[PDB]
Amino acid sequence: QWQEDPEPEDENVYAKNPDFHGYDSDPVVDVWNMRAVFFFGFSIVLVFGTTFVAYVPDYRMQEWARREAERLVKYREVNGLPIMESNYFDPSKIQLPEDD
């Protein structure tokens, strides 16, 4: 037979290091590889990130447009103009193909 190794068993890392956190076999590296992963993972990304993302102001202008509507609807209604006129680019500006 062609020489090759006998199947390597998978160790019960939980037999020694009964506090195994799943990162590395020797205990101190494990502890310091979860004390830095829960922290940088949860403690300052899911928390500081969500804080910053929550405070992004008027994202994509949708906080601005609910007022500009309100003053346009305030202005258009009181002055009697149609609230959403039916052509946007004014007809006067357009130079329609004359013949057709």
Ligand X SMILES: CCCCCCCCCCCCCCCCCC(=O)OC[C@H](COP(=O)(O)OCCN)OC(=O)CCCCCCCCCCCCCCCCC
Distance CA(52)–CA(37), nearest Å, equals: 20
Residue with Cβ nearer ligand X (25 or 50):
50
Tokens of 43: 């403690």
69 binds, among other proteins, ligand X, none (CB under 5 to 8 A by kind): none
Tell whether residue 51 is a contact of ligand X (CB under 6 A). Answer: no
Out of 16, 27, 45, 81, name the contact with other proteins by CB under 8 A: 45
Out of 16, 17, 46, 82, name the contact with other proteins by CB under 8 A: 46
Tokens of 31: 């502890």
The minimum distance between CB 40 and ligand X, in angstroms, equals: 12
DSSP 36-67: THHIIIIIIIITHHHHHHHT--SGGGTTTHHH
DSSP 92: T
Q: Give the binding site for ligand X (CB under 6 A).
A: 45-46, 49-50, 53-54
